[PDB]
């Protein structure tokens, strides 16, 4: 049974082809689809898609949605694969977790468009794609399994090119020391409040975030004698004992 | 069926991420009434749950506070309430706390936490206020939950000041007073006519409050404005198939007359 | 000082309730000695006619050797009703419910009227004893057959403690009057009269047999036939004195049966001879003194625990064999006399007997060692090891309590065929001091093994297997074809435990050269024949010695024992030892000059890369940075003697070819702040160091490689260098800042994101910080535990053939293999590779997780871990796994001095992998105790155990890589692998991806992609496990128990999806296995589902 092709919560079953293994004669990689929203600049007119192909990157999604565009007259404005986490190495950001700035869903690649009419045209096209794959398994709409997976994951013993990472960390240090000296100068230049309140600061401290986090992390001589109520309590002591 | 302790831990080993299994293991000790042993097993569970599943960590914290509300006492309830607000989202801990406090029937903490939490997360939302208003109308504090409009308008910014009178008019048409609810709705229809949702849902709430003479006046009094074809089909079908569900001859006449003018 | 006596009372409740099986059988032996009471006399009738009288009967007479021919048997062949006594085991209350069977002691000493003053010569009184036995068993068999209780009994002629001089009458019961649900073998024994002759014949310097080589064995045997009644008088009077004896001796017999020391005999070639009443005798002898001034060793003021401790202290600090032995007389102080009789000795002057002459010199030697070893592990106040000292029977396996084994098969043919089938002695003077053929070959073979090895082994034990003390009623003797002879042994166990520092030393040294060739050089040249000669040395000494051509597969201990066997005791017998060579080609043999002739205890490859590393060290210190080097420290597996290739130059194909070296600069407070910026500054320093390296010394070459063995840091590279001596080093910069950066990242992270960043910091600590003291400590200790690098290398190849290295880490495998070394109790340290490896697998099959931590201190023999740190380690273990209920995600607990947390290396491994390891260990020890060691046994121990658990892929890269990894493939020619050996560096360094394998890290990537659906494994030592061509690799996968069937579709299922219903989904297993092969499209060849 393949005619079951759409789930309860708007999920659009998207099957594709698989290539030829030398011993395998089938070939059902399954994806989901939605159309979700939020007013921020990374979730408006967007789509989930679940159960990703390995190294789903920008270029074969480019060619696949171009194939659908030239196939069944859908319009599409693709730009980038938003929040592509397939391996699981970019959840917690250590650099933002302990930095001054450059601060701030499992196998669900998100993808948004420019035109909501374009993403609705691809939505209707994809629902018809799901049911045409359900009807026939041989006149498929297709993302063929094109492989830049090889181009990024059979060559990983490569020496990273020396001049490239030279200029890369050259630019990284050249912006890091700039924003660092800017932050420290902003710290110990002069801080008056809205009213008159000069802020106490260290001799060689570096960040308002630093003094903020240390003020977050920083969240006797009585006498048993000498008073006449204490001679009252000690006469009570010296008559009870 | 789960009977023995090795069976339970076998369920939790072979199933790490189903709150059905997790609250089965919790509800076993809840039903055996060894609930302090369930408290230490809960301290096992909150730190042995996988941390990716936001809904399931909501499940295990909701279940722990369900334990502390069903049998505990307020000095540990505030403790696990503070720990829940530290670990996970304070606002959803507040909403589940308010629902569960009125389920366990403790007004002596429920009204005070309604006040404090509608103060807290009510300057960026509306539901923490309108749950309080609906609760006060349900427990017979009609004018007290009508006086909440000034509190809502000074708590929120300008952006959903339509939405506060929207929602308090919703609950006033639910079980408050219909004509006083229309006295709330007049600020909606005086502020914004060009929002086409408010008119339709206001006459639908007029239908669900069912004062039929003013239904037969309100539908007949909308139509003199600039009505576009989708809005015309909406209001037209919500009157005509409702009359399907003295006037039907005149609105059959208006099914054709207002095609012209 | 508290709970060991609670353990003692646990042993008491384990051993007790003997009444249900002493009362009924004391009633049954009461009926039995009533039957012996109504057995009447049988007067003097001649020997030559009782031959015919017993001829056609079923009772053919047993005999001591040889059969008494009537030319001199003019003895009084009487029979009288003897004296009954119910003594010994069931009268002094030392009965363990063993499923093998406790013994019994019923005494029938001979009456006064059937001997003479000079009856004690030429063992015809023992011939009298044998025919006495023959009539008693004939009379008893017809009486019990007319009393019709033969349906469950069976009588048998045995030997009293494996001695042919003393046969006994043992009764074994089988299935109202039957006794078969527990202990067997109720035996009766006759003895000699109490006091007969003045003690000159009783002295161990007697021989009255014909032409004086004395007979101390025989005048001890007849004296032990007679005078073991004063000793139980002594036992009973100390029993009436005080009470701790019964529990002290059930403890003693318990420990001695765990050590395999029963009181039969070690003169006959078996481990034993020492036993429980000997233990009683030395306890009660040390009662009234023990010192040289008879200072009281043992008071009954302290109970059995300190009685036992004082006993083991006296036996360990008071020699008996060669210098000093105990003296005591039962009729009465006890002292310590000064010399030794070259045999286990203690003198009892009221008997003139030598009670410890039932076992031999090597058996006493190994028992004094066991005294010292259990004393060492008993006197310590650190931990509690009562189950380590008692409750593990070490006697179960041969190669576990011993170190290696030889089996001499001697096909001598016949007793007459001796003179051309074996080169040993054949003399009156040897048959007068040795009972039989196995006895003289045993004493000769232990003396020639002792003289052949000397300072080459710790201890030798000889044990003839196929021996049995069992011969039937109808038969006169053990009439048994014992595989090429008719003597009571099949073949000779030669079990060796070795001083491991002189195994593969290829020259043993006799005395030097005087002109007058004295007797020591004489016996050296006689014992060594044509082979040994006198040589010069670099010192210039002229000394007697012999060359031992060391091979890899063969330890030279087997060659020297092969010559010491085939030169002296036989000339055509053969030696069986195939286990050592059977795994030594399972070791990988590197492409080194004369590497077959190199030993396995040679470390010249590791020293070669250490020399290359040191010249690199000098050329990286003699240059200038903007921030100087504080220290570099190699941390590599080769730098701690662990890597599976024994590291040959240019050997790229091993994935751990690149060793890793941490390097740290001085504490400059100028550093970048955030973590990506600081690791990029470390890359900047590595850019500068390789820039000056290629500037000045271009004979080294280098490149950069990203590392992702720490999670969530995207910008951490390592500097890899290729050294023209032919090696490759990773360099990772450490700073003083990364530790506090990770700690404050931990501090300011979101509270539901804490333990993952804690896991990141734990991986950092394991990779950078504690790894240095790890490799320092065990590299320092490997030169004291010399078999460590071979046992870890064979363990790691075993673990990769059984496919676990994709989850477990190599330091954890290293810690599991150091565990039997730094704590080898109750055993020895392993002087051989097999003994090490099966000690590892025996331990980890024993080992649990729920109530079992693993504390070890990597210290030198004889800085340790004291009581406080021990309790802290156990306490954080305790709260750790009461927080963790059963080991849901934390399985092992390996805690050292260098990591009291213990969770550093055990983290990350899945529960199926850990349970698979423990199950494989239990399967291996099951196979060991069932099938025995064999070539197919070892091949089954290195079978893949592929199990067809859901997933098999077969992978072959387009080239073979064993000539490139440098392990030679046992070829007939070395130029065949030399012209394919990669003795050149590749110029464009990108080609190492196709000169190496991608399988381990691609299985890593796929495992972290499918972390909650299926766990994958790949053979990461490619043709080390993949046959001979060097190409075969597998990919396997175990599916989770969650995904047994279709599950309700969600967004957090996060798996490979197939809606088979509108609500239920399952894997597209063919599509994802196809996508695995699609990623490995050039790597994959074959695939099998299920």
């Amino acid at each position: 049974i393949e005619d079951i092709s759409a789930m309860k919560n708007g999920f659009i079953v998207v099957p594709f082809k698989l290539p030829d293994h030398k011993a395998l004669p089938a070939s059902l990689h399954f994806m989901f689809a939605k159309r979700h929203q939020s007013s921020n600049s990374n979730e408006s007119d967007c789509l989930f898609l679940v159960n990703l192909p390995l190294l789903s990157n920008i270029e074969h999604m480019k060619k696949f949605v171009g194939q659908l565009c030239g196939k069944y007259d859908t319009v599409s404005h693709v730009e980038e694969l938003l929040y592509n986490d397939e391996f699981g190495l970019h959840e917690v950001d250590l650099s933002a977790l302990t930095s001054d700035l450059m601060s701030s869903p499992r196998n669900t690649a998100l993808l948004k468009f420019v035109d909501a009419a374009s993403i609705n045209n691809c939505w209707n096209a994809l629902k018809k794609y799901s049911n045409l794959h359900a009807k026939h398994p041989n006149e498929l709409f297709e993302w063929t399994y094109t492989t830049p997976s090889f181009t990024t994951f059979v060559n990983f013993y490569k020496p990273l090119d020396i001049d490239y990472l030279k200029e890369d960390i050259h630019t990284h240090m050249a912006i890091f020391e700039q924003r660092e000296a800017q932050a420290q100068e902003d710290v110990q230049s002069s801080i008056v409040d809205e009213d008159g309140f000069t802020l106490v600061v260290g001799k060689n401290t570096k960040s308002l975030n630093s003094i903020r986090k240390k003020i977050l992390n920083k969240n006797k001589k009585a006498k048993k004698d000498f008073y006449r109520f204490q001679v009252r309590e000690r006469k009570k002591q010296e008559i009870n004992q | 069926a789960p009977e023995s302790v090795a069976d339970f831990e076998r369920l939790l080993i072979g199933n790490p991420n189903s709150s059905v299994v997790w609250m089965n293991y919790m509800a076993f000790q809840l039903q055996l009434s060894e609930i302090e042993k369930a408290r230490e097993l809960a301290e096992r569970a909150l730190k042995t749950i996988n941390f990716r599943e936001e809904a399931e960590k909501l499940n295990i914290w909701i279940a722990m506070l369900n334990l502390e509300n069903t049998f505990g006492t307020e000095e540990t309830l505030e403790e696990v309430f503070s720990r829940a607000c530290q670990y996970m989202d304070s606002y959803t801990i507040h909403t589940k706390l308010l629902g569960i406090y009125e389920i366990s029937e403790k007004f002596d903490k429920a009204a005070e936490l309604f006040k404090a939490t509608a103060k807290k997360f009510g300057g960026e939302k509306v539901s923490i206020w309108v749950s309080w208003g609906d609760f006060l109308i349900s427990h017979n504090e009609e004018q007290e939950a009508r006086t909440i409009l000034g509190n809502a308008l000074k708590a929120l910014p300008k952006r959903n000041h339509i939405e506060v009178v929207r929602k308090f008019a919703q609950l006033e048409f639910a079980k408050g007073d219909p004509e006083r609810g229309r006295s709330l709705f007049e600020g909606l229809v005086a502020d914004a006519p060009k929002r086409i949702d408010l008119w339709n849902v206001y006459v639908d709430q007029e239908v669900k409050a069912k004062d039929k003479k003013k239904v037969e006046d309100l539908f007949e009094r909308i139509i003199t404005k600039k009505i576009t074809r989708k809005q015309a089909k909406f209001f037209f079908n919500k009157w005509l198939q409702f009359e399907e569900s003295k006037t039907i001859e005149y609105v059959k006449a208006k099914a054709t007359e207002y095609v012209a003018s | 000082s508290n709970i060991f006596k609670l353990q003692i009372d646990e042993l008491l409740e384990q051993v007790k309730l003997k009444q249900k099986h002493v009362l009924k059988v004391e009633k049954f032996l009461h009926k039995l000695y009533d039957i012996l009471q109504e057995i009447p006399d049988w007067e003097e009738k001649s020997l030559a006619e009782v031959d015919s009288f017993f001829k056609n009967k079923i009772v053919s007479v047993p005999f001591v050797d040889p059969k008494p021919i009537p030319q001199n048997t003019n003895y009084k062949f009487n029979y009288k009703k003897p004296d009954i006594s119910l003594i010994g085991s069931f009268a002094l209350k030392a009965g363990i419910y063993q499923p093998n069977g406790s013994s019994i002691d019923t005494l029938l000493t001979m009456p006064k009227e059937l001997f003479e003053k000079k009856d004690f010569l030429n063992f015809r009184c023992l011939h009298k004893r044998s025919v006495y036995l023959a009539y008693l068993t004939h009379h008893l068999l017809i009486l019990l057959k007319k009393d019709k209780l033969d349906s469950f009994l069976q009588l048998e002629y045995s030997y009293f403690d494996n001695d042919p001089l003393l046969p006994i009458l043992r009764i074994s019961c089988s299935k109202d009057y039957n006794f078969y649900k527990t202990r067997f073998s109720i035996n009766l024994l006759i003895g000699f009269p109490y006091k007969v002759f003045e003690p000159k014949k009783l002295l161990p310097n007697r021989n009255c047999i014909r032409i004086l080589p004395a007979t101390p064995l025989y005048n001890f045997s007849v004296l032990s036939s007679s005078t073991h009644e004063n000793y139980l008088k002594y036992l009973y009077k100390t029993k009436k004195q005080t009470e701790s004896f019964v529990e002290a001796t059930v403890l003693g017999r318990l420990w001695l049966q765990q050590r395999g020391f029963s009181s039969n005999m070690s003169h006959s070639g078996s481990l034993g001879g020492f036993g429980t009443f000997e233990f009683t005798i030395l306890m009660a002898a040390l009662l009234n003194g023990g010192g040289i001034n008879s200072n009281k060793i043992l008071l009954h003021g302290f109970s059995s625990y300190q009685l036992f401790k004082g006993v083991i202290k006296y036996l360990a600090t008071m020699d008996l064999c060669h210098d000093g032995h105990l003296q005591f007389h039962s009729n009465p102080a006890s002292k310590y006399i000064d010399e030794g009789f070259q045999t286990p000795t203690l003198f009892d002057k009221s008997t003139k007997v030598n009670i410890l002459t039932k076992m031999t010199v090597s058996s006493y030697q190994i028992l004094k060692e066991y005294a010292g070893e259990t004393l060492r592990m008993l006197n310590n106040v650190v931990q509690d090891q009562f189950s380590n000292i008692f409750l593990t029977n070490i006697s179960r396996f041969d190669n576990l309590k011993y170190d290696l084994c030889y089996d001499v098969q001697l096909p001598l043919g016949k007793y007459n065929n001796l003179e051309t089938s074996l080169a040993a002695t054949f003399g009156s003077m040897e048959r007068v001091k040795f009972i039989t053929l196995e006895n003289f070959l045993a004493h000769k073979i232990t003396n020639v093994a002792r003289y052949a090895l000397g300072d080459r082994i710790k201890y030798i034990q000889i044990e003839m297997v196929g021996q049995k003390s069992d011969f039937p009623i109808t038969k006169r003797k053990v009439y048994s074809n014992t595989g090429g002879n008719h003597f009571n042994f099949d073949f000779v166990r030669v079990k060796l435990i070795v001083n491991p520092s002189e195994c593969d030393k290829l020259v043993t040294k006799g005395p030097a050269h005087s002109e007058t060739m004295s007797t020591e050089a004489a016996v050296f040249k006689n014992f060594w024949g044509i082979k040994s000669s006198l040589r010069r040395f670099k010192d210039g000494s002229i000394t007697h010695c012999c060359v031992w051509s060391t091979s890899s597969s063969e330890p030279i201990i087997s060659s020297i024992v092969n010559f010491a066997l085939q030169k002296h005791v036989s000339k055509k017998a053969q030696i069986s030892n195939e286990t050592i060579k059977k795994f030594h080609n399972f070791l990988p043999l590197p492409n080194l000059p004369s590497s077959a002739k190199t030993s396995v205890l040679n470390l010249s490859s590791f020293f070669n890369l250490k020399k290359s590393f040191d010249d690199l060290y000098k050329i990286i210190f003699q240059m200038k940075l903007p921030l100087s080097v504080k220290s570099i420290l190699p941390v590599g597996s080769a730098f701690r003697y662990t890597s599976l290739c024994q590291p040959v130059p240019f050997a790229y194909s091993d994935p751990d070819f690149f060793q890793d070296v941490i390097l740290e600069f001085e504490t400059s407070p100028k550093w970048p702040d955030e973590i990506t910026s600081l690791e990029k500054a470390k890359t900047a320093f590595l850019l500068k160091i390789q820039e000056e390296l290629s500037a000045n010394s271009s004979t080294y070459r280098s490149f950069f490689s990203r590392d992702e063995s720490i999670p969530y840091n995207l910008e951490i590279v390592t500097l890899n260098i290729l050294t023209p001596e032919g090696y490759g080093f990773k360099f990772r910069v450490l700073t003083e800042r990364d530790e506090i950066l990770y700690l404050r990242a931990i501090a300011n992270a979101r509270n539901e994101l804490k333990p993952e960043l804690e896991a990141t910091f734990l991986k950092f600590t394991a990779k950078y910080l504690a790894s240095v003291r790890h490799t320092r400590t065990l590299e320092n200790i490997s030169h004291s535990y010399q078999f460590y690098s071979p046992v870890v290398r064979l363990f790691k190849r075993w673990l990769d053939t059984h496919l676990l290295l994709g989850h477990i880490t190599d330091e954890l495998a290293e810690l599991i293999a150091i565990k039997p070394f730094v704590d080898p109790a109750p055993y020895f340290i392993p002087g051989s590779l097999e003994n090490g490896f099966l000690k590892v697998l025996k331990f980890i099959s024993q080992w649990n997780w729920k109530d079992d931590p693993l504390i070890l201190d990597l210290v030198k023999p004889e800085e340790r871990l004291t009581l406080a740190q021990y309790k802290g380690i156990q306490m954080n273990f305790t709260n750790l796994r009461n927080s963790d209920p059963n080991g849901t995600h934390l399985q092992f607990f390996v805690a050292s001095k260098n990591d009291p947390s213990g969770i550093l290396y055990s983290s990350g491994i899945p529960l199926p992998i850990a349970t698979r390891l423990t199950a494989l260990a239990k399967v291996a020890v099951n196979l060991l105790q069932t099938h025995g060691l064999n070539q197919q046994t070892i091949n089954l121990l290195f079978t893949p155990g592929l199990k067809d658990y859901d997933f098999v892929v077969d992978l072959r890269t387009p080239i073979g890589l064993k000539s490139s990894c440098g392990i030679l493939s046992a070829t007939e020619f070395k130029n065949i692998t030399n012209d394919q050996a990669p003795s050149n560096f590749p110029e464009n360094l990108n080609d190492l991806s196709e000169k190496m394998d991608p399988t381990y890290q691609l299985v890593k990537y796929l495992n972290l992609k499918y972390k909650n659906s299926l766990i994958l494994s790949s053979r990461k030592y490619i043709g080390v496990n993949g046959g001979e061509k060097g190409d075969k690799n597998v990919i396997t996968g175990l599916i989770k128990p969650l995904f047994k069937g279709a599950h309700k579709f969600r967004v957090n299922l996060d798996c490979n999806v197939k809606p088979v219903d509108d609500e239920n989904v399952i894997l597209n297993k063919e599509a994802i296995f196809h996508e695995i092969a699609a990623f490995g499209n050039d790597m994959v060849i074959n695939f099998e589902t299920d």
Side-chain angles (χ1 to χ4, degrees), chain C residues 901-928:
Chain C
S901 87
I903 60 178
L904 202 54
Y905 310 128
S906 312
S907 291
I909 42 169
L911 190 58
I913 292 300
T915 45
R916 171 182 301 250
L917 185 142
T918 294
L920 258 58
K922 298 177 83 55
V923 161
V925 71
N926 190 11
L927 203 153
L928 189 90

Side-chain angles (χ1 to χ4, degrees), chain A residues 1 4-11 13 17-32 48 50-56 85-102 104-108 143 145 147 149-150 152-162 164-170 172-173 176 179-180 206-207 209-210 213 217, chain C residues 669 671-678 680-681 683-684 687 690 703-706 708 710-715 717 741-742 744-750 753 756-757 760 989-990 992-993 996-998 1001-1002 1005-1006 1008-1012 1049-1051 1053-1063 1065 1068 1070-1087 1089:
Chain A
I1 301 186
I4 176 163
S5 181
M7 298 300 112
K8 305 196 166 313
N9 311 315
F11 282 130
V13 170
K17 76 102 178 176
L18 271 303
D20 177 88
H21 172 47
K22 279 91 70 176
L24 278 172
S27 164
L28 307 101
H29 191 197
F30 272 28
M31 266 61 53
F32 282 8
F48 313 105
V50 206
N51 194 14
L52 265 298
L54 67 88
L55 201 82
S56 291
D85 199 26
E86 173 158 45
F87 287 90
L89 273 301
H90 304 76
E91 291 97 335
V92 287
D93 195 277
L94 214 46
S95 163
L97 203 76
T98 178
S99 165
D100 51 0
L101 74 166
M102 295 67 70
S104 275
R106 169 92 266 173
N107 57 86
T108 78
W143 165 73
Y145 187 72
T147 52
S149 152
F150 294 140
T152 82
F153 283 125
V154 303
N155 47 2
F156 47 84
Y157 289 105
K158 186 68 66 68
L160 302 94
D161 36 354
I162 311 298
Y164 157 72
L165 87 162
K166 258 192 60 189
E167 58 86 23
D168 176 70
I169 81 174
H170 172 89
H172 181 92
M173 291 300 148
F176 179 76
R179 60 186 67 255
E180 161 61 51
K206 282 186 200 182
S207 164
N209 190 14
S210 275
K213 290 297 292 182
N217 291 147
Chain C
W671 275 119
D673 199 13
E674 59 176 296
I675 170 67
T676 47
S677 53
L678 75 94
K680 280 194 198 71
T683 67
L687 259 54
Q690 76 101 32
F703 71 101
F704 283 103
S705 46
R706 177 150 322 279
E708 295 302 318
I710 301 299
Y712 291 103
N713 38 358
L714 296 163
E715 287 279 324
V717 317
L741 260 294
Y742 290 152
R744 86 190 191 199
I746 280 295
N748 62 5
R750 190 179 280 106
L753 298 169
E756 214 277 341
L757 276 309
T760 305
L989 300 174
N990 44 8
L992 276 302
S993 180
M996 295 151 50
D997 50 319
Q1001 56 267 10
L1002 74 89
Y1005 280 163
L1006 265 302
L1008 59 95
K1009 184 180 169 179
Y1010 296 143
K1011 63 178 77 67
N1012 42 359
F1049 82 108
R1050 304 275 94 90
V1051 77
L1053 297 200
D1054 302 317
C1055 191
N1056 307 138
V1057 72
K1058 271 308 279 283
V1060 307
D1061 309 288
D1062 194 53
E1063 74 276 0
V1065 296
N1068 38 2
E1070 57 93 11
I1072 63 166
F1073 295 161
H1074 184 278
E1075 209 160 351
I1076 286 178
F1079 181 42
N1081 261 329
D1082 219 331
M1083 197 45 210
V1084 73
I1085 288 178
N1086 183 19
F1087 159 68
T1089 325

